[PDB]
Paper text:
Here, by solving the crystal structure, it is shown that MtGlu5 from Meiothermus taiwanensis WR-220, a GH5-family endo-β-1,4-glucanase (EC 3.2.1.4), has a bipartite architecture consisting of a Cel5A-like catalytic domain with a (β/α)8 TIM-barrel fold and an inserted CBM29-like noncatalytic domain with a β-jelly-roll fold. MtGlu5 contains a Cel5A-like CD similar to TmCel5A from Thermotoga maritima, but has an additional novel domain inserted into an internal site in the CD. Unlike other known cellulases with CBMs at the termini, this inserted CBM in the newly identified MtGlu5 acts in synergy with the CD, as demonstrated by ITC experiments.
Author numbering: 17 to 327
Write the structure that this text describes.
Amino acid sequence: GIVELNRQLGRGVNLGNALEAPWEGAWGVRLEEGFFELIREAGFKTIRLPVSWTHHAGRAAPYTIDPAFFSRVDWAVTQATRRGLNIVVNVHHYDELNANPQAEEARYLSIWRQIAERYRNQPGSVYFELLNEPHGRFNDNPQLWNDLLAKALRVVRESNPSRAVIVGPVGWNSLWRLSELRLPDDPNLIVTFHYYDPLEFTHQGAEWLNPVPPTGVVWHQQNAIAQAMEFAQRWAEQNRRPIFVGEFGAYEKGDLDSRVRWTGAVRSELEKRNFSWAYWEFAAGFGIYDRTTRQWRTPLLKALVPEQPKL
Ligand SMILES: N[C@@H](Cc1c[nH]c2ccccc12)C(=O)O
Ligand code: MET
């Protein structure tokens, strides 16, 4: 069942700065077929595929997704699956929906119907993820997200009765907001959160934030990671849901040794708690792979996939 589907997610990586930008390449990463084999060879079982459908769908009903863009997603799904990787297909950035859930609902539900119907026959290694990091008006009223996610799950289930569906809390998938998350009585849900604490370290110099946190911040482990993951595990036990931590990572403007400390500490605690996970991200400013030199960033990769269990 769903506990085994979550265990099968295992270790994963996001293909970020790619299809979740305004278009593929705008944020620096075009997808390549060779990425799938590299990710497998590095020890990952899963691709998370952020996709920002809003830039590629009609604004007026029936909100049709551009066929050429859809075919690109088809290709990613098919190539990952054929090469033995799981793939998580989400709806990723969606400024309109976070700002105005009620107004944008119709278009978002049409997008999910299109995705669900198109991929209804994909195997169980293909997972759906309803909405990356709900924020905006969902932060003001978390019940708006509880209501909307139930509508979207109902849409998905019309064509995909048993597929694993990944659902997170508001606060940009903050684990503390699990407290307000409410889920339908559906036995094939995996709960997700993202982990970037402390933001002053993991997002130092991140220009896409306002305010932009200053750089020069170092990091070492205290108790915050253990405290956060224990909270999340108790929530998951009480509510009988498996956990997938779909993003964690530290931006390259922090010093490498601090980033390695943080990445290894997080990965270790996730696996101690039996959480599957996907690192943010493959090839860009948080990347473990440098496409310019075609080399892995060894210290970061080994913090994710250690050669010995206590390293
Ligand atoms: N320097 C690497 C990784 C990288 C750093 N910042 C990025 C921003 C976007 C894309 C890639 C990157 C590259 O150019 O590929
Ligand atoms: C805030 S930068 C890391 C990526 C971002 N959290 C996303 O979900 O795309």
